[PDB]
């Protein structure tokens, strides 16, 4: 719940599916990687064992 | 004062009651004589008008009107102090009487205030000028007549002021003499309006003096009048209000918006009075107070487009002309503008049939208030947001 | 006369809805002067003090 | 700072459009204020 | 600020009778005993106590 | 000389024998409209100018009470606070939806992407009874411990009310209220590598005990054995549901419930 | 402060007490013969200044003769020359028995 | 919808809304004082 | 500023005007003599007081 | 929008700046990659 | 069904337009504003200044204007003021840094002028009964006074409109000025097009 | 401008400024400024060499 | 729209002068005329009529049809004026090729 400087803070969970992340930058400059604060299954009740 | 026997009437009871025939009745001078009267009472004479032989719910529904005429007496009050200033500051620079006064045009103000600056007083010349620009909005004799008429109508309707502007010891003028006086004039002015303003009843809700139910029921009886003397005849079948002449011309008391709004179910479509006119349909809708709830009143394509085909079918009108409508009202009283845009888009009816129905919308000036302009402006939900806006 | 004082009330009426909102105006509606024209009396006031 | 050299030229900024700095239409040639150099013993001392 | 019933108007009207000043009691005829009407045949005499 | 900028005991007139009561009433009179001429020049002495830089930048009326002007179907409506969606710690929801917003207590279901707060609420009799204010300076203080950035703080009227006054002094290089019903964010301002909030306590270490803090009390804090001393900002929620510093609550001679101390 | 003819003519800001109401005057004689300021008494309320140590107007207000006048103070000048204030109680003469007007607009104001 | 509910507005806020109606009958120093003040022009024109 | 008009005055051998140091520091003045009213000191109000 | 064939022809959109930067020549190139090893983590006040 | 939780996000259900914000840098931004069309996000020796409007495409309004042509000067008249990063906080939701006037709003009220104006013509006999031409559209001199009444009152209400127009506009190149004649330097870091102002 | 304009005493309104009379003049003549480049203001001339 | 050209192009004129930096208009007076000239155009029913609506987005376009087709209180004497999308675009037009 608190995030320092340097260390970057929780992924976006995306839509299921997962392919328009990309698509949604379209619009953004063609050659967009997909964006490090996204994620499919970023999920903060996942019980680590 | 509310002593026994004294109980709020209705307007057939003040029909009945206030109804003695003269005809040197002048609007503006029973008025007058009635409103300075109203502003020499001192803040007691509103203190025992609550006839006391009522329940607990009707007493404070009393009260309420009641603070609500007062209130609006003494904005007139003020509003007439002020204006009685414009005018002695008028008379006063000028000379001329302020009789003469609430009739000069800007032509003989620019020509006076020209003679003004001649000898010399231009900062009098600007007084004067705004005096003037202002009583010019405010100084015409029925500024308000139509909502002066109204709350003295709801005055009259307590049956509690009826006898508080009687038998006042006077003095007179230069002939300085005491006297009694008699001339109840609320009696001779409530009388005229009475007898002049047979739909003032309905007058008073569109006015929106009717705070409790806002002027739904009048009009409901305003449409059932404009339809029934407009075509040939509209029967009453419970709230169904069509003809026989054999148009599909139909005025349908669907129902009650609010209500339903804030009953236990929500949907989106409730016209309140479903007026159909051969191919036209028209769902006119009294909006709502709850800015949160004016988003849900106006009917989806999917409802405009499902009573377009329905009515196609049983109403049997060929599908190509069918067009269904919404019209909204404001939502706590009736400006001139929704009357205008009832009469003339909605229902058929041209000026020399309106002038002979409805012959008081000629001197109807209600307006939009400010805070509530932006009643019509519903709030855009894009699809994806069905879960968090109304 | 802090806050533990009785209090001091509204110098006005408090009234519902056609009060002051456009309907017309009160006697503090015509004294009141737009700074262009000059006052009606004069005095010497002086800049320093006037600002 | 002064060692540095980057950055003396911003005192000189205003000669971006050359039109504009022979003109003098606005006054605030100055880095911090009216001039590049108004009140450099004092006005910095403001700073804890 | 208190409204003189009947018997209170017809108190001070006493009053002015014996002082000898008739100013004195037309502003309680102004401001009060004003809405006093006589019994008019139909209505009843003792209307009953109500609050 | 050309100038620029341009009597009753002069004209000696025969004083009038004012009947012993056209003098004591003439007396009273003269006493009374000096004492409330007094009244009135102390009024404009003591006057402060919040209240003084506005009676005459008010003066823009016009002779006629106009007709208010209709404009675009919506300018009047608050904008939100831009808030990027995808780099972030809540969204920061909308105002239309404010029919989706719950409360702290019971919120509503929005970011689940995100961990939620819980509540601070113990179990006996033997325990304190903590609360938002106590939770909200002791999550600032362990943040400012451990060098954090942004802290996720629960989010009642007066946490935010602390916040907001502890980013006008400073103490906080931000704040944000997403709406979250339960939580809200506080981004920390460092300097030299100390934290700017020195220390940070609450005026209660339980809830069951508010602190009414007299303005007397609240006075002889600022007041640092004769040196005027605004240093360590006091936050203290008065009467009227507001939530102020000391400072503002001593300006206004008002005292409110004691909320934290900080500095 | 200027002389033309030797005599000298200063120039001044008269003001309450309290600096609210001031009367500018552009060049007055200075006659170190008279012993007191003769202003008119036109200026008796323009710088009658209530403030609150002087509860009235001034402070001191005595019907004199040179009775012709309202001798009053204390009045603030201001010489343009001068950064001390001059604090005065002039003589509050009435421009009826001594009409001090002497040419088109000017004044005969002597300090 | 409370304001009118309970019990009705006791009439002497009137004396609020109205500054004419309330007044102090006799006047400040006939109770015997009138002579307090030494150098009131009351006292001047008792005493002489 | 104003130890040189004190030489001026000095050299032209006419008196200063010792009230110089109070109208250039005017400022300075009032806020001694309110400090001084505030604290009840006298002298000349110290960094370490403000 | 609603008509805009004229200039929409010649529609100039942004560049690969990404892979500009991505393909730009690095100082730290290496012809076979290592992913490198994990670094100290401080494991309490008791264990450094 | 319910798509996403918060229902229209920029990134995963619409399209990201604008810039991406891996810091919160606009997140955690103070409304310098009431109607918060400006918000601020200062550091200790910098001021970044963001306008937040883009339900408008950044189409400054009027007032809008006339608040940030005084809090651009408000931050670059600060002591710890080094630089002022001005720019625009899309917040996925534009790719405008600051759109024009918003000509939507100066059509509004052009048009409602135009209907006055017109709504108070539809009354007169007699608009051009004068002969100098200075003469603007009130105060056009009427015999009658019912009818003067009603026209001053719409004529009056024509030229407020225009005004509230003449007004945006100034408003506008005012701070087109604040910006020019800002004493401090004002890195105004233009993150998206930009339409005429 | 509306309180530099109170502190200029107001808006004195004089009529007919600048409307012109049927000779094409106007009546009212108007107000006339006076300034110019001063000519005899270098500074050096005055505070010289001793 | 074409006045719209020939109005612009005077204004390049007027903002450029001779066209030598000694007269090319600063900023004072070149915003001065920019405001001359917009605030004379904006009077011109060309834009707020026709050439406002244009830059409405085509769906936003249809947001204002539906409404207009459907809301009474918009189209008959509204309390503020809702566009005509055929008082605004000509459709088919032909102008010399094009």
Known sequence: VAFDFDDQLHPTRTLDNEGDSYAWCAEQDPTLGPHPDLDASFDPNRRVF | HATYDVAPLSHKELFSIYQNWDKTRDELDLLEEVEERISKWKLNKWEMRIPPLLTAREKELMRQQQELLKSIFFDWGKCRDALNKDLELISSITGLPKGTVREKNRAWLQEEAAKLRWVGEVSKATRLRDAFLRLEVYGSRDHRLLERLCCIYGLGLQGSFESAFSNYIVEDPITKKIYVDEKNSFRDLLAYIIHTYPQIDIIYDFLGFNFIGGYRSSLRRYLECMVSRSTEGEKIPGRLVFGRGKPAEILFDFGNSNESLVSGECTQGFPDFVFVKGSDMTLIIIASENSWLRNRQLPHRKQMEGIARRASFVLGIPFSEVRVRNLLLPPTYLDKDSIVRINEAVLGLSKEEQRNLAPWLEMYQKELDSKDVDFCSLMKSTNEEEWLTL | GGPGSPVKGPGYYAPPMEGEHQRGYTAEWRDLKNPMRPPEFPTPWERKYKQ | FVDLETGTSLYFRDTRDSAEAVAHAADSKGLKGMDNAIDLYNEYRIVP | QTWPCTSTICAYLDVCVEAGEKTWAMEAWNRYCTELKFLQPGEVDPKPVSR | AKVYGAHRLLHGKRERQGSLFAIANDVKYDEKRLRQQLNAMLEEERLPPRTRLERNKANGGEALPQRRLVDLPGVERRRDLPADPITRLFFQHKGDHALYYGTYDNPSLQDEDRIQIEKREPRYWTYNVFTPVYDFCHRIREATEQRKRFVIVPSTVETRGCARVMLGHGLVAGFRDFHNDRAFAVELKYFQGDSTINVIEPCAYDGKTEFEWSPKMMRRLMNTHGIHNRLVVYICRTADNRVIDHIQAVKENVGGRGLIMVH | ?111 | DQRYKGIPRPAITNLHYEPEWNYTLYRAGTHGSQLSNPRSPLTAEVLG | LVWHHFKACYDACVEPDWTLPKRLFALEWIRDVRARKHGLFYGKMRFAEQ | SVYANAMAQFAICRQPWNEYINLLTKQDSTPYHVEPQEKPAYRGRKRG | NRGHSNGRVPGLNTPFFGEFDRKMMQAMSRPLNADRTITGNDGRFSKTIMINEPKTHQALSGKTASELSVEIDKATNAVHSKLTVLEAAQSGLTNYYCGGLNFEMLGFDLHMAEMLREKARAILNGVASVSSTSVMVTTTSVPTKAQEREVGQLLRDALRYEDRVDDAIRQHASLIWRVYTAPRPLMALTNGKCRGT | ISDMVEDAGGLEVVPGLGELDAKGTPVVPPLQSNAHVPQNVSFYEMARHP | SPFALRAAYEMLLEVRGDGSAERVMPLAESLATEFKYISRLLRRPDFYRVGVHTDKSAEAWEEIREERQRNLHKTHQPTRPLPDFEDVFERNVEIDGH
Do not use: C
């Open chain 7, 1 to 111: 402060f200027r002389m033309k003819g030797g005599e000298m003519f200063v120039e001044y800001k008269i003001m309450s007490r309290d600096h609210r109401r001031s009367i500018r005057v552009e060049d007055a004689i200075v006659d170190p013969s008279v012993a007191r300021t003769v202003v008119p008494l036109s200026w008796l309320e323009q710088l009658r200044s209530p403030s609150l140590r002087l509860h009235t107007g001034y402070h001191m207000e005595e019907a004199v003769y040179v009775p012709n006048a309202i001798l009053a103070g204390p009045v603030v000048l201001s010489i343009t020359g001068q950064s001390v204030p001059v604090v005065l109680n002039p003589y509050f003469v009435p421009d009826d028995t001594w009409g001090i007007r002497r040419n088109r607009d000017e004044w005969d104001l002597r300090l």
